[PDB]
Design a protein around this nucleic acid. Structure first.
Lengths: 159, 171, 185, 58, 51, 222
RNA sequence: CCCUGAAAAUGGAUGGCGCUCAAGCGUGUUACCUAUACUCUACCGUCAGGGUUGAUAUGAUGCCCUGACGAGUAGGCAGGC
RNA sequence: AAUAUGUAAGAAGUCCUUGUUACUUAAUUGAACGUGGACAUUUGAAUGAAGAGCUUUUAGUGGGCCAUUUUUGGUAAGCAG
RNA sequence: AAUACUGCCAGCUGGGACUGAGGACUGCGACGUAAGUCAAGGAUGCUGGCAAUGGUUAUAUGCCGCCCGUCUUGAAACA
RNA sequence: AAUUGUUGAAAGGGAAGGGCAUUUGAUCA
């Protein structure tokens, strides 16, 4: 027949990295998790208790519950034509912090610092980011950089 | 189209690690500046590790013939991809300008080897200044002294669909 | 042709002009349309929009609810406006003096207001006294308190009043509602 | 008389005709699945701060 | 009731652009540039014809 | 009731003052255009003369027209076209050049032709097929009053000001472009010039970037 | 490119007529014809945004202004004989 | 690798002071909810949006096929998947 | 110096076809120092012929056009 | 009405019937 289990088709997914087997480094257990923090989910093969499902591997979610050694994650799963929230409790081991949120707090702090300093005089704060604008005009000098003529090479039958 | 010689000089995007990148210049026969730039980039990303996103063109100009009123003999080395493999050829054309010579060469190759513009690659175009290094008989036959050849069987063009006199092909 | 990003010739989804054939209601609708068109007060537009509401969308407002609304700070000297019917509540005993304008008034509610010292005016009189709706307060009754909305959205693990005719034992109280006979909802 | 078993054709179009909607978020989320001790202490703290606010500002 | 096209109706063109009258009076559409003359460097001259 | 003449005179005085400001601003814009063009030309001349090469700045504005029908379109390019306001064939919009816009154009390149526009073709487009968006309606622009009423908050009050905002990308270019309805052009008068439109410009077709060659096609289609 | 390889049964298919510095083959450039496609205009219907109780004067479900759209089986709704 | 895919790009935010708890901490030590107070041009990347959100009812549907690309069984199939 | 090519003209002008919608004024502009005028939020003036144009039907001509309804992914079928 | 006979009109190289536009014949304000 057909087989669709809790750990089906995870042979290369729930597997430790090369030369990275054994116990887990004592850094994950020292991370402090609070309600509202955004974290990523990455299953670890050494610990088989509280392991997330295949779908929730690599997903990013907010923390809503704190337990002895576990946190609750809310993940939006697309079923049919709608997104449904899923509150799943996972161990600390199979969860890591997300650096995008930290970059957001850093940008916010710099944003407020610039809003203070620039507005102390009140001129062109320009607190908003901009994309890659087209390059402006430039002048190139051929002092020791004379353009070398290039021609296509003949076809060769090297073996 | 009416091919025109465009020389394009380009260079990699400047970086703090390597300021003032080297400039590479290439002459391409193309219909317009867009085609010339596209061919320049395509040829550059075949001999050098560069790309359009990781490079720029600092100059593009059109080369006009210094003496377009003088009949010249041109030797062209080309490399083309056939239906089965890649081959190298050397063809001799007789024309007053490089653009006309390469247009004639393109028509010749597309008609005689079924090679398209995507297949013919211009390796080198040169002018043979001495009429002794030519190795093609179809070009040598037109360099003979006192060249006089008639035009037998002249065909005239009529503006009417009916003619009241039997035409004559004299000349 | 156009690669349409939305439905073509789609209706606004709102009720323009009353669906009823009440001549007096149409006259009131015309009057409030004139007001809301030739004035700038949003009160006229709100009243005109509420005049198009259906019976289920226009729940009755009780005198106790009116008193509770007027008990707010600064609302004692305000004109109550009910777009619908005002009912009488016997659970209240002290009704303060007020001025309530509504389409239809229950006889008991009208008697209660008259005895308290207030008056019962219509929407036309309310418009005459306050063309721009000055010092008015709009009251709307509970819309989700109907018995027909409890059955809406019935599903497992919802508890949304299953549609039944009889009530009591052995009437949809068996397996499917208890853990002793299988599963619970 | 065999028949087609399973196919995912037109399912994406069917789901996209009515655009896939993200769940509606609220300032106060549901307090289910939370630690019972934390919920009890939150209830006690909420009662305390409500009483303090009522006593302070009227 | 009907859209009239600029660049063909002078009245509408003048209504849209009051500067059109000054432009026509000064003939700014055909202006002679300064008769300045510069010679390209020998490096560029040789690179143009370098084969 | 005789004050009609007084209001008429006041209206005429206000209109004359407004026309004076418009004329001054138009003269300033024309002077700036001439100065910029001449400055670029002389900069190229000095760069050529001093044994150097002048690398022109990349164009900050492009014009994109749709050359493909609304049938047999993949969903992601279709969505990108809808977001770019190209729902009819032979419809054109102006686009500011950024990284995001460049990657957007790289996705729907097969169904559009885009290139760097010029001041003359921009002015011709705005004059002939220039339509605004007021109350979600396509009201034609035949006076500066409507433009001032719908764009005066951003410092734009005339058709010449709108053209200036289009040609030179500024603080309010987004609003200036959003106010203008997409230009519904016709088929080219002299033809597309190629036997097969659905091939790249280097490959001999209308599909792809045309750079400065877009001006001729736009004027032929307009 | 062409030729041998290359043989199926009613009489027949680059559609055929026919074509040989082609009207066959590859490529380069202009002009020419057209879809219910694109731009404008006239009319009808639908939708949206509005004006119009300061009247004798009626149909404010009436009149007028502006913009956009108009395919379709099963099926739904609405207006009419 | 490419493609495909999740999250964040702000007022439901940030910062200063300090009220509550039966949670927790050696402990006013942390957590949640708070009060007061400060930050509206440029409210925190680009683009777009005949506006968006929400509820009730129900007709018909539950035999599909073909086209590009990836690809299973089969020598192949206008074969099946 | 001229010329080829490209792009611009808020430079001028010759010829041809379709369209005439709206119905006392309201607005935006130009000429005219000023009266007033205008190609400026949709065409008027003059003149000619008749008191045939045009509607319905039959034939003819150029082109197109398979038999109604149902089943079916597929109908006009030799269903 | 299906069907049939006469009178009057039209067409008819292995079908008839219809649509797009017009000439001709008959008729019509």
């Amino acid at each position: 027949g057909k087989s669709h289990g809790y750990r089906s088709r995870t042979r290369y997914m729930f597997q430790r990295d090369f030369r990275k087997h054994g116990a887990v480094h004592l850094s994950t257990y020292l991370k402090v998790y609070k309600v509202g923090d955004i974290v990523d989910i990455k299953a670890n093969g050494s610990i088989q208790k509280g392991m997330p499902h295949k779908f929730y591997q690599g997903k990013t979610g907010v923390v809503y519950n704190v337990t002895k050694s576990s946190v609750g994650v809310i993940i939006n799963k697309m079923v049919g034509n709608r997104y449904l929230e899923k509150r799943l409790n996972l161990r600390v081991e199979h969860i890591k912090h997300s650096k995008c949120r930290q970059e957001f707090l850093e940008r916010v702090k710099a944003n407020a610092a610039k809003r203070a300093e620039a507005k102390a005089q009140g001129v062109a704060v320009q607190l908003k980011r901009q994309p890659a604008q087209p390059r402006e005009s430039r002048i190139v000098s051929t002092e020791g950089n004379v353009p070398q003529t290039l021609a296509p090479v003949p076809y060769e039958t090297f073996i | 189209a009416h091919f025109k010689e465009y020389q394009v000089i380009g260079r990699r995007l400047p970086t703090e690690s390597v300021p003032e990148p080297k400039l590479f210049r290439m002459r391409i026969f193309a219909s317009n500046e867009v085609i010339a730039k596209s061919r320049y980039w395509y040829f550059l990303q075949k001999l050098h590790k560069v790309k359009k996103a990781s490079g720029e063109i600092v100059s593009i100009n059109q080369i006009n013939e210094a003496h377009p009123t003088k009949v010249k003999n041109f030797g062209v080395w080309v490399r083309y991809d056939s239906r089965s493999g890649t081959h190298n050829m050397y063809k001799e054309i007789r024309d007053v300008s490089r653009v006309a010579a390469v247009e004639t060469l393109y028509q010749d190759m597309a008609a005689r080897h079924r090679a398209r513009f995507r297949s013919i690659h211009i390796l080198k175009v040169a002018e043979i200044e001495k009429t002794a290094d030519v190795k093609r008989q179809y070009v040598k036959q037109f360099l003979t002294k006192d060249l006089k050849f008639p035009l037998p069987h002249r065909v005239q063009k009529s503006t009417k669909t009916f003619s009241y006199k039997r035409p004559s092909t004299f000349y | 042709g156009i690669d349409h990003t939305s439905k073509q010739h789609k209706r606004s989804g709102h009720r323009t002009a009353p669906k009823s054939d009440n001549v007096y209601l149409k006259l009131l609708v015309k009057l409030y349309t004139f007001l809301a068109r030739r004035t700038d007060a949003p009160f006229n537009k709100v009243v005109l929009k509420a005049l198009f509401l259906s019976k289920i969308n226009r729940p009755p407002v009780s005198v106790s609810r009116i008193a509770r609304a007027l008990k707010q700070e600064g609302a004692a000297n305000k004109t109550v406006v009910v777009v619908g019917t005002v009912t009488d509540d016997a659970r209240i005993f002290e009704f303060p003096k007020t001025t309530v304008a509504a389409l239809r008034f229950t006889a008991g509610a009208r008697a209660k207001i008259v005895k308290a010292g207030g008056e019962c005016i219509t929407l036309d009189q309310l418009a005459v006294r306050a063309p721009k709706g000055q010092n008015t307060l709009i009251l709307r009754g509970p819309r989700n308190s109907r018995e027909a909305v409890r059955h809406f959205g019935m599903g497992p693990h919802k508890g949304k009043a299953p549609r039944i005719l009889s009530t009591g034992r052995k009437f949809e109280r068996a397996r499917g509602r208890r853990r002793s006979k299988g599963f619970k909802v | 008389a065999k028949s087609k078993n399973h196919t995912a054709h037109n399912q994406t179009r069917k789901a996209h005709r009515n655009g896939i909607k993200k769940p509606k978020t609220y300032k106060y989320p549901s307090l289910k699945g939370v630690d019972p001790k934390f919920r009890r202490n939150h209830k006690h703290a909420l009662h305390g701060t409500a009483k303090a606010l009522a006593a302070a500002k009227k | 009731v009907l859209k009239k096209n600029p660049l063909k109706n002078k009245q509408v063109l003048l209504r849209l652009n009051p500067y059109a009258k000054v432009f026509a009076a000064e003939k700014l559409g055909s202006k002679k540039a300064e008769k300045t003359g510069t010679k390209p460097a020998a490096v560029f001259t040789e690179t143009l014809k370098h084969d | 009731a005789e004050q009609v003449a007084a209001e008429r005179a006041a209206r005429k005085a206000a209109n004359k003052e407004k026309r004076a400001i418009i004329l001054e601003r138009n003269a300033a814009y024309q002077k700036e255009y001439e100065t910029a063009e001449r400055n670029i030309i002389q900069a190229k001349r000095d760069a050529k003369a001093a044994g150097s090469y002048y690398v022109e700045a990349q164009h900050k504005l492009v014009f994109v027209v749709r050359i493909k029908g609304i049938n047999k379109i993949p969903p992601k390019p279709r969505k990108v076209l809808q977001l770019l306001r190209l729902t009819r064939i032979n419809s054109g919009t102006f686009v500011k050049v950024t990284k995001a816009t460049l990657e957007l154009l790289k996705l729907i390149e097969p169904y559009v032709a885009y290139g760097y526009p010029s001041y003359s073709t921009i002015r011709q487009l705005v004059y002939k097929r220039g339509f605004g968006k007021i109350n979600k309606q396509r009201v034609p622009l035949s006076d500066n009053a409507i433009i001032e009423a719908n764009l005066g908050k951003y410092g734009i009050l005339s058709i010449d000001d709108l053209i200036h905002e289009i040609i030179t990308v500024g603080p309010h270019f987004k609003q200036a472009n959003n106010f203008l309805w997409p230009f519904k052009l016709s088929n080219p008068s002299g033809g597309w010039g190629v036997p097969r439109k659905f091939k790249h410009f280097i490959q001999g077709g209308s599909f792809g970037n045309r750079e400065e060659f877009i001006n001729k096609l736009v004027k032929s289609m307009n």
